[PDB]
Amino acid sequence: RPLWFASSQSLSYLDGSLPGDYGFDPLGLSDPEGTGGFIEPRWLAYGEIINGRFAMLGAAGAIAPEILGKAGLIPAETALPWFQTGVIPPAGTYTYWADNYTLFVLEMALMGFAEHRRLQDWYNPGSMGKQYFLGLEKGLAGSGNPAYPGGPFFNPLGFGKDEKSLKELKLKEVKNGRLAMLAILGYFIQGLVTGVGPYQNLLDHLADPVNNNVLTSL
Amino acid sequence: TFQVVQPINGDPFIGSLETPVTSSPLIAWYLSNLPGYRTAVNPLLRGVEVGLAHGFFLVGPFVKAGPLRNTAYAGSAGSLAAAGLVVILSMCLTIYGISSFKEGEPSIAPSLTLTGRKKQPDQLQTADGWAKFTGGFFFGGISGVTWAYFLLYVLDLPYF
Amino acid sequence: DFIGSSTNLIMVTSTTLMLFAGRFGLAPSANRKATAGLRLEARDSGLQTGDPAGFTLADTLACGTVGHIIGVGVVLGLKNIGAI
Amino acid sequence: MRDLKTYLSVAPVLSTLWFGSLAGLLIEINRLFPDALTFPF
Amino acid sequence: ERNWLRRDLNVVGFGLIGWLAPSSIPAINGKSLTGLFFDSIGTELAHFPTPPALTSQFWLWLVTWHLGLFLCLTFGQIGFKGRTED
Amino acid sequence: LVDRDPIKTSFEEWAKPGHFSRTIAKGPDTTTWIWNLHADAHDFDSHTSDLEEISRKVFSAHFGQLSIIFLWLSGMYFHGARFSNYEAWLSDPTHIGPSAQVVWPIVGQEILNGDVGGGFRGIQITSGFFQIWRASGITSELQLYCTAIGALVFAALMLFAGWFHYHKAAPKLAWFQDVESMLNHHLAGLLGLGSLSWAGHQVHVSLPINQFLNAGVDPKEIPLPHEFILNRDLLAQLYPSFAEGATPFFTLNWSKYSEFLTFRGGLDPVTGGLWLTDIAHHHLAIAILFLIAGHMYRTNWGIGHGIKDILEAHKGPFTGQGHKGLYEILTTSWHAQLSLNLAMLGSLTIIVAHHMYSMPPYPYLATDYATQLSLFTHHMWIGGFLIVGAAAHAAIFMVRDYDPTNRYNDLLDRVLRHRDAIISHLNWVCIFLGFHSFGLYIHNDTMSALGRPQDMFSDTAIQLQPVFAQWIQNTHALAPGVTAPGETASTSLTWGGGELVAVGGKVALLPIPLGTADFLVHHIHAFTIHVTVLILLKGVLFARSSRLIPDKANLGFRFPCDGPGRGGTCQVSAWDHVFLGLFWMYNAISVVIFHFSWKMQSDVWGSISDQGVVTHITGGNFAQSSITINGWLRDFLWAQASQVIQSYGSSLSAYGLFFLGAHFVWAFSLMFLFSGRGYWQELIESIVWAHNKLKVAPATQPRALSIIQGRAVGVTHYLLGGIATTWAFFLARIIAV
Ligand code: CLA
Ligand code: CLA
Ligand code: CLA
Ligand SMILES: CC1=C(/C=C/C(C)=C/C=C\C(C)=C\C=C\C=C(C)\C=C\C=C(C)\C=C\C2=C(C)CCCC2(C)C)C(C)(C)CCC1
Ligand code: SF4
């Protein structure tokens, strides 16, 4: 297998079982010696997968309204950058059907239901498919692997029927998630120093790459 | 590896150590030539040297710091005080010698050198030797005080 | 111009000189330890580097930092007395 | 909790509670009736 | 217990020369530490035997010169003797 | 490396006192059990012999200490926001006395709410928090309220961390013994990054706000701190070099930042404190130095030093094997590390106390005399206590953890083989210093009583000039322009430049002359310090054995005697040497603080008129009156105690009450120090007799205090009484004048 900044310590426990494994661990955070707390290989892999999925949802979301505004498809009052949509009211605010602090409570409650069920399945595998939940517990039984639950709810189309195809698709998921985390960090620090949306930043770079660049922005 | 500090005479069970301060050749030579360590000489002659050296010194502090230092009687008063102190010290030496030593007994000084050679024990550790030492010390101390006073206040030497 | 200025030249020279000394055995490294007599003894670090001489990323960062420190000191010292 | 109730019956905690209540009562008594030098009733 | 210093008097000349050589460089506004000390010595001998005053610069030069000289002598002794024991 | 859930969280152990010890868990047959419960509470070594368990226990208690400190800071910040006159003081610092405590009117105690200015009634504080907040740019009480809330949150976080790292994930022993990584992190991250962050705060907040305040602007009209960040035009108006941004930093054009990064030296004439630009430059340089220093020790990447390798290479012809073996001792014993750190921290505290008075770092601090005196005395006492604790724990290590069969070290072995010479030389030095320091005071007293003032050691009859310190003062006064060309003024005004700084009609600082009295008092200080070092070092060196008791190590570290034999063996343990050195530390620190107080009131502090003539508080009587013991009794203790004895009926009556209370407490300690246990045990037997008569005899048999407990009670009460008396005297004297 290809290797990327591997070391003698890191290769002693990264044997290639995990998807998207290249032996990269300079700090040895996943060393199985004395695992405890939140520093644990299984928890670290699960966290990487979940963060990748959430960043992949966020990376396209923070730019989808902006490009359609410059394309003249959505009204200009909704083509706001991600930092002037109500996330940071000091930077700007938009008036929705409810005040922002009210929406926060509803989001908190729904996300609490979903995430508490996910955590309780992580703690006790197969526990969420036992107690009566509106008759939806029949499909929320999980599969024994916390990161890949499958089932009629989380695998509707039935992709990845073959195990080799499943491994390839897991590798693709990991790669795309890592790329999306990088893009999200780029979003944050681009917004910090240029003070304008990432799509406009890309258009600025395309217009003139030498006058509109880091050497001229910082 | 070279080590400087060694046990005393090579015996590690005697309560002392040998250091450059104690066993340097210059320090060893200097101490062996002082009158108090010349075990083969008449105690009277060592006492005379010790008395001369000690009496000569005592004049200075008494003269310079005394209650009459700022008056015309500074030198005479200082010399008289030094002579009185010499007399007191002579009395102390006589009393110590009477108390410690008994007539007719042999000397109690060690008779072994550091190299193991046998030597005649010092006669200063006997009644007669200590009496001679005290009588030499008194005569030496008076002579030294008188010499210091004479040099300082009979000859107008350019001192200070 | 800043690019042709004396500060640019001094700093580049210092950094390149320190990196050269670290790579070609003229300074201590992850693979070379100075003893009490200032003699380099061979060491194995356990770090894969993909370099013929064994020169690691940690060697590179350290040598760059030392070169930058020396260059900054020299530049400021010369600037103080009016030489540059 | 039986063990928690046992820890509340130990000497220092009980003494502290008793003395705190006592000091509070005395402070309020002296606040309602200040400067008492004689028993007038 | 004898000859505890392992006497080697070549150290005295080497240390003295290795102090006098760098200390003679005139990096102090055109003057050298050794030069300043020697000029101070010359100035205070003009009123012999009166001692230097408390405000004179002689004491500072004396202390700073002898500090470096003693460092050179001590390190020279340690280096000469330590070559054979390590 | 940690362990998951090593100890269950339960209330069971709360109901069984003494569970940490097998002997104590049995039950209270006598009253000695109750005292034994508290004395052995935190001796984790006696509880278990496993080093990992001791390390895990030690790690968690520091979190509780941090939580308590954060709670104290939260209270201090909250009281300034709610019960203070800070906003009135901010408009007139020179005429308003700071106050942050108020009292409920209950039994007539509202008399303590005296006036302090600004329409406020409360207790005047001398901790100096007002100047700290002013130097940080704090203007309103909202900021103080926010800071108090944040401190409360941090205290909660510390408590949770303390619970977690003991009950959920406890680190292994290999984690604790990584000294190279700990040193690297504590140097580069804890200190360097903290200094850099404080430098950034001073650059972006303190400098503009303090410039606006010094210009005379109303504090309510000053822009908020965030306005200087969002609006670079304001900072450019204040400092033009800010218009260039960070470009000068990266082009090595550092000279452009000379407006707010200076090397001036001296004091600010308006406020009487150090220039803040100098402080910002100082913190920046210190941050750089600590960041560089944190890359010295070796870790997972092979580059760096090994502490064991450095230690093993330092040996000589006089010391044999040298420092080889010291690495294993300092990585397996908690007591030796504690002793070393205690000694260093005490020395640092004393250095800090000396440094803060001669270079006042806060605005309007030099002209607040009470704050200066209080800070000096407080930090001196803290340093002394820590220094004594160092020797205590060194003796504990010598008794317990010393084992040459597995932890041999040549340097420690050689010290123990010539201890008689060390102790005898120290004894002679102490006797010589005592004769030639205190004897000169008795000579002066006798000559003065006999009517012979021309035979005294004084500036008029027989001078003893401290010429070495005067030379240092002259060298430091002429440093700028010769040996420090980059400096404009001297480091301190006390070196003797000749300039005077006056703030609001009062003297802030000026040159301090040295004469015959300073010589005597400095040698008194040296004598006292040497005697204390004698008592503590004798106690450490003879902990295991002596010619009197060869087997002293078998009896332990804390035992009373070995009986009346060998002529008598009272006070032979190493604990008794700390008990005896506490009294000498008290003596030395008392003398030092008395010297500071009298010298400051006599030669420095005072008021300045329009024509430029200085009138000091006591009129410069230190030079001629302090050369005798009668002078100290009359012109210092008798004269300056009139403020505290006349404080009844005013707002300072609390100090008058504390004076007598501390006198009583000090005198009460002599009962425990002069008497012995047998008398009190015999006396109790008669008292128990009448309790048996009335059927009120307790089942827990009353016992007299042990020999060690009586000694400890006596010394504790003795120190409390003396220090409290001096505290009340100082505060009552200095607040009034
Ligand atoms: C960071 C500082 C530090 C730390 C962690 C320790 C830690 C330790 N020390 Mg120690 N010590 C220190 C500083 C420190 N010391 C200093 C500075 C000194 C010099 C004064 C000492 C002197 C010392 C001695 C002499 C002894 C220890 C001992 C010990 C060990 C047991 C402590 C114990 O059980 O406490 C128990 C704690 C108490 C009994 C509390 C005492 C309360 C004080 C004295 C009075 C406070 C008055 C208070 C204000 C009044 C309010 C009362 C209230 C009820 C109303 C423990 C390892 C003992 C040991 O190792 O024995 C083998 C031991 O004998 N220490
Ligand atoms: C005010 C009472 C007092 C006095 C005078 C002393 C004096 C002394 N203590 Mg001390 N001590 C005291 C209280 C006192 N202590 C108390 C309360 C405690 C607590 C228990 C201790 C605990 C203590 C310890 C633990 C130690 C001492 C030691 C010493 C001696 C230090 C060495 C020395 O030469 O000092 C200088 C001596 C003096 C200042 C006394 C001389 C007084 C002047 C010069 C008069 C001289 C008169 C002259 C000779 C002519 C007289 C002739 C005659 C005919 C009139 C010294 C004799 C130490 C010791 O043994 O020596 C190292 C030691 O280890 N003390
Ligand atoms: C209920 C408990 C109790 C009772 C009934 C007595 C009764 C007596 N004690 Mg006494 N005593 C007690 C507790 C008690 N004591 C305690 C705890 C101590 C230790 C501080 C003493 C120390 C003591 C001494 C030193 C002396 C007496 C003496 C006496 C006799 C003289 C009368 C008197 O008031 O003396 C004065 C008694 C005191 C000042 C004791 C202080 C009062 C304490 C604080 C009360 C504690 C009560 C206790 C907590 C009960 C809790 C009840 C709860 C569990 C329900 C008398 C028979 C004297 C005597 O005749 O000699 C034989 C005597 O010289 N006692
Ligand atoms: C040929 C070759 C090559 C080459 C390359 C190179 C040569 C590069 C380099 C470069 C580099 C690698 C650089 C580095 C650097 C580093 C650093 C630089 C770090 C750090 C530092 C610091 C952190 C500092 C700081 C400071 C400050 C801020 C202030 C004061 C001063 C000082 C300076 C101290 C390659 C590989 C491509 C390929 C193969 C072949
Ligand atoms: S019981 Fe007291 S007097 Fe007797 S030997 Fe022990 S300490 Fe000394």
Least CB-CB distance to F15: which of D3, D31, D34?
D3
Mark yes or no for CB contact C46/A8 under 8 Å.
Answer: yes
CA distance readout (Å), F247 to A215, A218, F197, F242: 12, 10, 20, 10
| Backbone phi and psi for residue F124, each to the nearest 5 degrees, phi listed first | -75, 130
Q: Are C45 and F302 in contact, with CB atoms under 8 Å apart?
A: yes
- Helix (H) / strand (E) element for F123: namely strand F123-124
Query: How many other β-carbons are positioned within 10 Å of the β-carbon of residue A85?
Result: 16
Helix axes F516-541, F419-450, angle to 10 degrees: 150
Instruction: Please state, in angstroms and rounded to a whole number, the distance separating the CA atoms of residues E5 and B26.
Output: 13
Output the CA angle F707-F713-F716, nearest 5 degrees. 140
**CA F677 to ligand 5 centroid distance, Å:** 9
Burial class from Cβ neighbours inside 10 Å (0-12, 13-18, 19+) for residue B130 reads: buried
Element (H, E) at F2: strand F2-4
| CA separation, residue A100 to residues A115, F494, F538, F645 (Å) | 22, 62, 73, 66
Q: Which amino acid is at C10?
A: I
Q: What are the angstrom distances between the C-alpha of E82 and each of C36, E15, F314, F319?
A: 12, 16, 12, 14
- Nearest-angstrom CA–CA distance, F93 and F272: 12
Is B114 strand, coil or helix?
Answer: coil
Ramachandran class of A115: left when φ > 0, alpha when ψ lies in -120 to 50, beta otherwise:
alpha
| H or E element that contains B18 | strand B17-18
Strands (E), F560-678: 606-608, 614-616
Distance from CA of B5 to the nearest CA of F (A): 7
Any ligand 3 atom below 6 A from CB of F693: no
CB within 8 Å: B3 and F320: yes
Listed in sequence order, the residues at least 6 apart from F114 whose beta carbon sits closer than 8 Å to its beta carbon are: F121, F124, F650, F651, F652
- The helix-helix angle for B127-153 and B74-100 (nearest 10°) equals 170
Subunits with at least 3 CB pairs below 8 A relative to chain C?
A: A, F
Tell me if F1 sits within 8 A of F176, measured CB to CB.
no
What does each C-alpha distance from F633 to B109, F594, F638 come to in angstroms? 55, 12, 6
Residue nearest to ligand 5 atom 3, measured at CA: F570
Query: What's the Cα-to-Cα distance from F34 to each of D4, F28, F701, rounded to whole Å?
Result: 21, 7, 12
Q: Which two tokens stand for residue A94?
A: 């938009």
Q: Do F3 and A33 touch (CB under 8 A)?
A: no
Q: Position E22: which residue type?
A: P
- A53 is annotated as contributing to ligand binding: yes
d(CA A96, CA A86): 9
Ligand 1 midpoint to CA F168 (Å): 29
Tokens 């007994």 correspond to B105
Residue A4 among known ligand-binding residues = yes
Let me know: does F21 contact F46? Beta carbons within 8 Å. Answer: yes
DSSP at B41: S
Q: Which residue's CA is minimally distant from atom 24 of ligand 4?
A: C65
Specify the residue for token string 């998951």. Answer: F4
Interface test with C, best of A1, A3, A8, A27 (most C CBs within 10 A): A8
CB-based contact F421:F414 (threshold 8 Å): no
Compute how many other C-beta atoms are within 10 angstroms of the C-beta atom of residue C2.
Answer: 7
Instruction: Say if ligand 2 is within 6 A of residue F423 CB.
Output: no
Q: How many CA atoms lie within 13 A of A146 on its CB side?
A: 20
Encoding tokens for residue F383? Answer: 């340093």
**Chains in contact with chain E (at least 3 beta-carbon pairs closer than 8 A):** B, F
β-bridge pairing F506-509 and F169-171: unpaired
* CA distance readout (Å), B85 to B35, B68, B152, F60, F435: 22, 17, 19, 70, 21
Is C touching A (3+ C-beta pairs, cut-off 8 A)?
yes
C-alpha A173, offset from chain centre: 11
* Short-list F364, F336, F172, F140, CA closest to F271: F364
Is residue A31 packed enough to be buried (19+ CB in 10 Å), middle (13-18) or exposed (0-12)? middle
Residue A173 marked in a binding site: yes
Kindly write down the DSSP assignment for every residue of C19-51, as one continuous string.
HHHHHTTSS-BTTEEE-TTS-EEE----B----
Q: In this complex, do D31 and F106 lie within 8 Å of one another by their Cβ atoms?
A: yes
| Three-state SS letters, F469-490 | HHHHHHHHHCCECCCECCCCCC
β-strand partners of F616: F606
F698 Cβ closer than 6 Å to some ligand 3 atom? no
Concatenated DSSP letters for F507-568?
EEE------HHHHHHHHHHHHHHHHHHHHHHHHHHTSS--SS-TTGGGG-SS---S-S-TT-
Binding residues of F, as ranges, are 561, 570, 663, 671, 679-680
Owner of token pair 């000749």: F498
Query: Chain B closest CA to E2's CA: distance in Å?
Result: 7
Pair E22, B22: CB distance under 8 Å: no
Other CB atoms within 10 Å distance of the CB of residue F470: 17
**Strand locations in F144-279, DSSP E?**
169-171
- Amino acid identity for residue A117 in this structure: R
Q: Quick check: F342 and F386 in contact, CB under 8 A?
A: yes
Q: Which two tokens stand for residue B68?
A: 């009459």
Residue with token string 């006591």:
F618
User: What CA–CA distance (Å, rounded) separates C5 from C13?
Assistant: 13
Residue of F458, F456, F431 lying closest to F443 (CA atoms) = F456
Coil vs helix vs strand at E2? coil
F502 backbone dihedrals φ, ψ, rounded to 5°: -125, 130
What whole-number distance in Å separates Cα of residue F191 and Cα of residue F182? 12
Q: How far is the CA of C60 from the centre of ligand 4 (A)?
A: 7
Pairing status of strand F606-608 against strand F614-616: antiparallel
CA–CA distance, F607 with F94 (Å, rounded to integer): 13
To which residue do tokens 């006292």 refer? F528
Burial letters for F124-138: b for 16+ Cβ neighbours within 10 Å, e otherwise?
A: bbbebbbbebbbbbb
Within A124-162, residue ranges assigned H as helices are 151-154
Who's near B145: CB < 8 A, 6+ residues apart? B55, B56, B58, B59, B79, B82, B83, B86
User: Are F470 and E59 inside 8 Å of each other by CB?
Assistant: no
The string over F146-157, giving b where at least 16 C-beta atoms fall within 10 Å of a residue's C-beta and e elsewhere, is: ebbeebbebbee
> Residue E55 is encoded by which pair of tokens?
């405000």
* CA E80/CA C36 separation, integer angstroms: 15
Yes or no, beta carbons of F303 and C62 under 8 Å apart:
yes
CA F28, CA F24: separation in Å to the nearest integer? Answer: 8
CB C67: neighbour CB atoms within 10 A?
A: 22
Alpha carbon of F687 to ligand 3 centroid (Å) = 10
Q: Do chains F and D touch (3 or more CB pairs under 8 A)?
A: yes
Q: Alpha-carbon distance C26 to C23, whole Å? A: 8
Using CA atoms, how far residue B43 sits from A2, B102, F733, in Å, is: 99, 17, 68
Q: Show the tokens assigned to F120.
A: 């406020």
- For residues A31 and F100, give the distance between their C-alpha atoms in angstroms, rounded to a whole number: 53
DSSP state of B107: P
Q: Which atom of ligand 1 is nearest to the CA of F41?
A: 34
By Cβ distance, the residue of A9, A28, A37 closest to F2 is A37
* Residue F108 in tokens: 């007539």
Distance CA F711, CA F39 (A): 14
CA distance F336 to F179: 15
Task: Report which ligand 1 atom has the smallest distance to the Cα of F388.
Answer: 19
Give the H or E element holding residue F4: strand F2-4
The burial class, CB within 10 Å (0-12 / 13-18 / 19+), for F299 is middle
**F357, two tokens:** 């008075």
Q: State which ligand 3 atom lies nearest to the alpha carbon of F693.
A: 57
Atom of ligand 3 nearest to the CA of F702: 19
CA distance to partner chain F, nearest, from residue B30 (Å): 23
Looking only at Cα atoms, what is the longest distance across chain A? 63
How many residues appear in chain B? 160
> In 3D, which of F382, F379, F375, F374 has the Cα closest to residue F732?
F374
Question: Is residue A40 annotated as involved in ligand binding?
Answer: no
| Neighbouring residues of F651: CB distance < 8 A, sequence distance ≥ 6 | F111, F112, F113, F114, F115
Q: Are F182 and F330 in contact (CB under 8 A)?
A: no
What resolution does the deposited structure have, in angstroms? 2.8
Note if the bond before E49 is cis, omega within 30 degrees. yes
With a CB cutoff of 8 Å and minimum separation 6, the contacts of F319 are F410, F411, F414
Most F CBs within 10 A among C1, C10, C45, hence the mutation to make, goes to: C45
Place of tokens 């700028």: F480
Amino acid type, F63: F
Encode C32-55: b = buried (16+ Cβ within 10 Å), e = exposed: bbeeeeeeeeeeebebbbeeeebb
Phi-psi region of B8 (alpha: psi -120 to 50; beta: other; left: phi over 0): beta
Q: How many CB atoms lie within 10 A of CB B129?
A: 21
Q: Which residues in chain B touch residue F420, judged by CB atoms under 8 angstroms apart?
A: 15
8 A C-beta contact, residue F209 and residue F222: yes
Query: Any residues with CB less than 8 A from the CB of F387 and at least 6 apart, and which?
Result: F342, F343, F346, F347, F585
Tokens at F703, concatenated: 């016992």
CA A77, distance to chain mean position in Å, is 28
Q: CA dist F377 to F231, F356, F528, F730, Å?
A: 45, 12, 17, 10
Q: Under 8 Å CB-to-CB from D16, ≥6 apart: which residues? A: none
Which residues of chain A from 26 to 55 reach within 8 Å of chain F, CB to CB? 28, 33-34, 36-37
C72 by Cβ neighbours in 10 Å (0-12 / 13-18 / 19+) ranks as: middle
> What is the 8-class DSSP label of residue E28?
B
Nearest CA to ligand 3 atom 10: F691
CB F646 within 8 Å of CB F705? no
Q: Among all chains, which residue has been given the structure tokens 């700071």?
A: F98
Q: What share of chain B is helix, strand, coil (3-state, %, to 5)?
A: 60, 5, 35
Task: Count helices and strands (H / E) in chain D.
Answer: 2, 0
Query: Cα F588 to the chain's mean position, in Å?
Result: 15
Q: Are F167 and F5 in contact (CB under 8 A)?
A: yes
> Do residues F204 and F228 lie in contact, with contact meaning Cβ atoms separated by under 8 Å?
yes
Distance CA D16, CA F34 (A): 17
Task: Count CB-CB contacts under 10 A for residue B151.
Answer: 13
